[PDB]
């Protein structure tokens, strides 16, 4: 009859609104679930799925402060379109004003306490070391709070979460495999991170990824992973993702021991992602901790077989973007890495922090950063790393004596920009693979090829060639000069060829009676001014080697 | 009874082969709506969704010209696989050959003429500047065309479009927010832009965004946007988006006036994305008008606050290519911009032009620009901007006496390339952070490092310091070489140092006698040719700067 | 009553577990067909969609070795969520360690056998060449292996397969055209390529891609394209690909004859992609063959029209990256090409191999490549191309005399790294557009300009401005020196300014009587000794050219 030919013709789906408990639609569910009404929750409530593989459709809202967990999904599962809301309405910070510019001081954070479940963030003890004096300044009611509404999925295989979206919202991947946060729909974030793999019991984590979409505030980071490997075949991390406003940093894999063990992460994939605006970092790719390390990596490699921050972490990272970080652009430790295409501009904090040792980094800039020069420099490697192109400076001026590079063990190569070089330090900075060169000025009556030995002095040029024009700008005629220091005097002593035009090289000689060590070549002469008899005399080192001192020019 | 038990368990789904207009299956859909025969609309239909979250999935054809208008959908709607055809087959004009080289004849391109829905575009009033010449040349029938299949969706928030296409097709966003047009399966456009994000009225757009997808001919646009602010948060735009063959240009951001109030945009997203053989420009992304621009700003800011071309646009711009633009590949203008990771290559047109100030440039290839030299330069840019790194010149010659950059008020450093040093004009051009350096040279006798005064002449070396192989290749031996410029001849006073291997240093002097002012420092001497006695004297600035002439060398 | 009601309120689908047959259940389907139990399939089974516009939802696995055909499906057909698995668990290799190096030693390539359907790859003839010794230590029951799970898709357009996995899994595109494998959910490969778009038969595949997801594993490359022409629209290709650990190479256009004719590909998009670990090649983008070419084109240009690897392929190539690769981790040929923005890292096998005439490389990243020393080169180039932006060497050393770069017909600019100069050879190499230049020195007691003349030496410095302390770290002074190689001892004649802080130019003179030929200029001397009067003398090249001897010092 009918219902045979119904059951065979028609697609399975069941729908909240037939049901007082998602409990009961879960376990009538088949093939679809549709959420047509929203559902409040209660933190904790978890509901088992049977193991069956759901493909669930949001259209309506999840409503609670705490967890809803998903149990017991089948491999292949799918979740779209599910929003997250809080219950509570917390009081939040917006540390920046109407024409974005970063708010530092702490009085005038505090004057932008607000009660909302978005457009700022609640505060946490991150903010107490971030504003310094804003721990005495908040009112009670704005601290230690703990507001976000979370769509756990715990223990499962191979489920996907896509289009999710929602207000003081977060997602957490609980002892997951090869799941993934995909298109994420700019959901606002609450006290947790907005989407967290965290495999800190059972396997490590593997097959977890963020693809696409973007998330906004949050009091914490917005992506992070604990606990998660991607093996060789790098099969996990974060491709093609945006973080707004983090609380803490955009992109995070976690640093040190979580609970009773490693929280650190290995063979990632951090690709073609932005960060913009965190109030921490952009990307904080580091598996040791910073300040105040621990002296072991319970469950990780230890400190015997690998030296704090020279863990093999292996990430695959390539083609990232941060603009305006108040922390670090870009952070990340490790020993062996392969680093490429990194670009942060425009940051009140530094561009790069890296405590990474045999490390290569290729085409790397870092543009206008430090801006508000609460850091030591723009660009940090501790370890003997090599960098591949690098590009320093915009717009912005520097004040102080802050240095641009400060990278003492490491070989750098290709830098472009206008640096001061003063603020250059490296173990060794070299162009050479450069063809026919040349030196091209404008806005100046000469050009200019410098040379500077930093160790002589950071900020004065050693010696220089030039070219100087004379006469007017239409004379066709200019004299070349070939110059040295002498009493930290730039250009001090010269020779030249062709000034005024004259078709002649005018030549120094020493000043006085020329000491015998003062010439250096055999088969040279070394012009010396004899001022009792109005000549010139010669220091002449024979071919032979033996000195002779002769006259050269008289009255 | 089973019809309970029916109602629970099945999706829910209506199909437009049951109802005579799509208003009939819209009132009765209550979750999926199917379009699963080809539906005929008449320009203006328009459909009321009651406010109901759908997910409408076509599998067929909407067929009409004008607007198939869509309203009152609830937030999370989505319409996937939708195809817009027009009932008119307009005549197209297809201005390349099959070379895929661009016509630029008037009476070339005319002669190209077809009737079809695809495979070039109706000709606009654009076309009349394009080409000059074609508004005379062309047919009645190809003049004034207005054909386009066009679904609007109008003033709702959260619907997405996803894998749109179709013939003569567009895609209008109409005072909407937080909506996407998604995965475009490569919609062959009309006479309308492809898609449309237009926000005139109501509130300014906001999250609006055009993701991945691509389209290819069109009139005019491929992707456009009138009247949106993205935010701090930067929730708008065009990420990982591929147009082909636009009759105007491929992603634009609207300049100007457009009836009674601004079409500007600011806080939008231009990334990863690709535009190919735009007619006019691949990325057009200034806000104020270039020519005979308006003496104001209704409904923004006003010129009093910010003058022309110096708004705070915004906008997060990177990592662009455009390949084949007939008109500029990437345009802009603003103040306080940061851009970068731009690449331009094989265009007829200019690669760049940025009436941009104190905006930053990093990162940027412009490469085998002004191909047909329509352009006076390949890259401009007006104000005072920094530019740091520029790749110039891939294989391609050029003729005449066009310029490569022409940036006068701006400061450069890391052009690589090929460039004809006369063809760069800046304000500044620095390498101030080289390492130790190396001049390589293939396929000369010589290796050298020159220097040039722009000032003095932008077509000539005014000096030089070269090696020079001594004898065969096989020598061993060079010698080195400091020269000056003297009567616009390069190279025309020099001092040597191993001519033929002979290890001594070989000293231009003045050839005549030499007056007082030719000597320019203290303690130095220069030689001059006193003919009458066959010696060479020298003019000596004594250590206490006094002049005396001595005798130098005699018979 | 109820049956016509529900008729149209409820969604169409059809169920694998309620029909014997696959056949059986796509006659009954409508519009969905649900994939609800593990279906094991025959070799060739054929299933016929009738034309149907198909939403096939995959929620369990096909099972079986060989093709499962899928017919007759219309456009706008979706398959989601397919898992192919072999009947068969066949014998792989492994050639990889524990710590991720390769092995590259047949016998240790042996030692890794295990059956497994996955974590390896069934060798075929390519591991012969690639594992040199290989073919006679394997045992007979892994050679000639040929297990592959194939979901096939034939002669269809409009089709996208959304999500796939699988073990030993393949998929084939035969015949068809508008149809797109989209993101790919990691499926392991078996025998066959993992992702297959082969238009030998019938009209030139057009409309096809790859867009995201990954793949790992796979005997054969894991995404090849065989006779596609995507037209001057660049509609098709590979966009945000990722291949790990293929057989052969992670994206491939075919080279040469297929049967009876073409298998090259033309106006292909290969963008925003990465491939790491290929135990071949990277991209391989070639379309003539290499070694032992055929005389001929069967079906397509003839070789009197375009010479071998001449073709005017016409791709679209940007935003790729390699690492890992064991043969070459970019590889291409054609003429005209135009390539960006390509990074190749960390790789045993070399770099870059480009068959390419008349083309242009802008942004080049060849880091760390030949690592294992089996290739003359990290990038070579045959043809008369340009290069604008090379990036050389990261933090590995070269034993050999291996080349770094080989482009003899090549002109680069913009090379940055610490290469070796003896290790490039090109045939122009230029910085024709630098500032005004600072050479900065770190690490040592002297700054350098160097010049090197190939033609003279590749491996000893021709000439030289130094600046070098003089005294201690803190003494305010340097000389300045001129330096020119004889009797290939660099640095073996010069000219010096304030040596020992003396103020004065020391000047090298010739050591005995000067020849005639000596002097070059006119209106210059020369300095030479005169041994047997204990005197200089001045060969003097007087203004009017003619020559007379000086004496120029006395006792
Ligand atoms: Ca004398």
Same mark, same amino acid.
């Given at each position: 009859?009918?219902?045979?030919? =119904?059951?065979?013709?028609?697609?399975?789906?069941?729908?909240? &609104?037939?049901?007082?408990?998602?409990?009961? !639609?879960? *376990?009538?569910?088949?093939?679809?679930?549709?959420?047509?009404?929203?559902?409040?929750?209660?933190?904790?409530?978890?509901?088992?799925?049977?193991?069956?593989?759901?493909?669930?459709?949001?259209?309506?809202?999840?409503?609670? #402060?705490?967890?809803?967990?998903?149990?017991?999904?089948?491999?292949?599962?799918?979740?779209?379109?599910?929003?997250?809301?809080?219950?509570?309405?917390?009081?939040?910070?917006?540390?920046?004003?109407?024409?974005?510019?970063?708010?530092?001081?702490?009085?005038?954070?505090? =004057?932008?306490?607000?009660?909302?479940?978005?457009?700022?963030?609640?505060?946490?003890? &991150?903010?107490?070391?971030?504003?310094?004096?804003?721990?005495?300044?908040?009112?009670?009611?704005?601290?230690?709070?703990?507001?976000?509404?979370?769509?756990?999925?715990?223990?499962?295989?191979?489920?996907?979460?896509?289009?999710?979206?929602?207000?003081?919202?977060?997602?957490?991947?609980?002892?997951?495999?090869?799941?993934?946060?995909?298109? !994420?729909?700019?959901?606002?974030?609450?006290?947790?991170?907005?989407?967290?793999?965290?495999?800190?019991?059972?396997?490590?984590?593997?097959?977890?990824?963020?693809?696409?979409?973007?998330?906004?505030?949050?009091?914490? &980071?917005?992506?992070?992973?604990?606990?998660?490997?991607?093996?060789?075949?790098?099969?996990?991390?974060?491709?093609?993702?945006? *973080?707004? %406003?983090?609380?803490?940093?955009? $992109?995070?894999?976690?640093?040190?021991? $979580?609970?009773?063990?490693?929280?650190?992460?290995?063979?990632?994939?951090?690709?073609?992602?932005?960060?913009?605006?965190?109030?921490? #970092?952009?990307?904080?790719?580091?598996?040791?901790?910073?300040?105040?390390?621990?002296?072991?990596?319970?469950?990780?490699?230890?400190?015997?077989?690998?030296?704090?921050?020279?863990?093999?972490?292996?990430?695959?990272?390539?083609?990232?973007?941060?603009?305006?970080?108040?922390?670090?652009?870009?952070?990340?430790?490790?020993?062996?890495?392969? @680093?490429?295409?990194?670009?942060?501009?425009?940051?009140?904090?530094?561009? =790069?922090?890296?405590?990474?040792?045999?490390?290569?980094?290729?085409?790397?800039?870092?543009?206008?950063?430090?801006?508000? #020069?609460?850091?030591?420099?723009?660009?940090?490697?501790?370890? !003997?790393?090599?960098?591949?192109?690098?590009?320093?400076?915009?717009?912005?001026?520097?004040?102080?004596?802050?240095?641009?590079?400060?990278?003492?063990? *490491?070989?750098?190569?290709?830098?472009?920009?206008?640096?001061?070089?003063?603020?250059?330090?490296?173990?060794?900075?070299?162009?050479?693979?450069?063809?026919?060169?040349?030196?091209?000025?404008?806005?100046?009556? &000469?050009?200019?090829?410098?040379? %500077?030995?930093?160790?002589?002095?950071?900020?004065?040029?050693?010696?220089?060639?030039?070219?100087?024009?004379?006469?007017?700008?239409?004379?066709?005629?200019?004299?070349?000069?070939?110059?040295?220091?002498?009493?930290?005097?730039?250009? /001090?002593?010269?020779?030249? $060829?062709?000034?005024?035009?004259?078709?002649? /090289?005018?030549?120094?000689?020493?000043?006085?009676?020329?000491?015998?060590?003062?010439?250096?070549?055999?088969?040279?002469?070394?012009?010396?001014?004899?001022?009792?008899?109005?000549?010139?005399?010669?220091?002449?080192?024979?071919?032979?080697?033996?000195? @002779?001192?002769?006259?050269?020019?008289?009255?």
């Amino acid at each position: 009859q009918y219902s045979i030919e =119904a059951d065979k013709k028609f697609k399975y789906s069941v729908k909240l &609104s037939d049901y007082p408990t998602l409990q009961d !639609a879960a *376990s009538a569910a088949v093939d679809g679930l549709l959420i047509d009404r929203d559902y409040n929750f209660y933190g904790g409530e978890t509901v088992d799925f049977g193991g069956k593989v759901l493909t669930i459709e949001c259209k309506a809202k999840f409503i609670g #402060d705490g967890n809803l967990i998903f149990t017991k999904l089948g491999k292949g599962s799918r979740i779209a379109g599910v929003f997250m809301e809080s219950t509570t309405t917390p009081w939040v910070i917006k540390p920046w004003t109407d024409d974005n510019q970063w708010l530092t001081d702490a009085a005038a954070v505090v =004057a932008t306490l607000k009660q909302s479940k978005t457009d700022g963030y609640q505060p946490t003890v &991150s903010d107490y070391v971030k504003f310094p004096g804003i721990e005495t300044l908040l009112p009670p009611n704005a601290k230690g709070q703990n507001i976000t509404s979370t769509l756990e999925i715990r223990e499962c295989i191979g489920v996907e979460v896509h289009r999710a979206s929602g207000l003081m919202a977060g997602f957490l991947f609980r002892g997951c495999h090869f799941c993934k946060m995909v298109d !994420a729909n700019n959901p606002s974030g609450g006290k947790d991170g907005i989407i967290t793999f965290e495999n800190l019991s059972g396997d490590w984590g593997k097959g977890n990824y963020v693809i696409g979409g973007r998330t906004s505030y949050g009091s914490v &980071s917005s992506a992070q992973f604990l606990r998660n490997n991607g093996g060789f075949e790098r099969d996990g991390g974060v491709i093609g993702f945006t *973080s707004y %406003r983090a609380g803490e940093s955009g $992109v995070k894999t976690w640093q040190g021991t $979580v609970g009773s063990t490693t929280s650190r992460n290995y063979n990632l994939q951090f690709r073609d992602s932005v960060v913009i605006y965190p109030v921490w #970092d952009g990307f904080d790719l580091g598996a040791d901790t910073d300040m105040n390390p621990e002296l072991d990596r319970p469950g990780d490699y230890p400190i015997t077989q690998y030296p704090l921050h020279q863990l093999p972490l292996n990430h695959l990272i390539d083609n990232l973007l941060v603009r305006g970080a108040l922390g670090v652009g870009f952070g990340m430790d490790g020993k062996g890495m392969y @680093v490429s295409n990194i670009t942060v501009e425009d940051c009140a904090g530094s561009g =790069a922090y890296l405590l990474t040792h045999e490390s290569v980094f290729t085409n790397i800039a870092i543009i206008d950063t430090n801006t508000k #020069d609460f850091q030591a420099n723009q660009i940090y490697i501790s370890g !003997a790393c090599r960098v591949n192109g690098l590009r320093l400076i915009g717009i912005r001026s520097t004040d102080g004596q802050s240095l641009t590079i400060d990278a003492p063990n *490491s070989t750098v190569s290709g830098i472009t920009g206008m640096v001061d070089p003063s603020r250059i330090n490296v173990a060794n900075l070299a162009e050479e693979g450069l063809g026919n060169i040349r030196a091209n000025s404008f806005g100046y009556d &000469s050009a200019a090829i410098k040379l %500077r030995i930093h160790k002589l002095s950071k900020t004065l040029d050693s010696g220089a060639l030039y070219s100087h024009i004379n006469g007017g700008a239409g004379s066709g005629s200019a004299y070349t000069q070939l110059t040295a220091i002498s009493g930290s005097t730039p250009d /001090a002593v010269s020779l030249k $060829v062709n000034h005024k035009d004259c078709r002649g /090289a005018e030549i120094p000689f020493v000043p006085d009676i020329a000491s015998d060590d003062f010439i250096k070549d055999s088969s040279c002469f070394l012009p010396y001014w004899e001022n009792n008899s109005t000549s010139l005399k010669a220091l002449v080192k024979k071919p032979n080697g033996e000195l @002779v001192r002769l006259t050269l020019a008289t009255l």
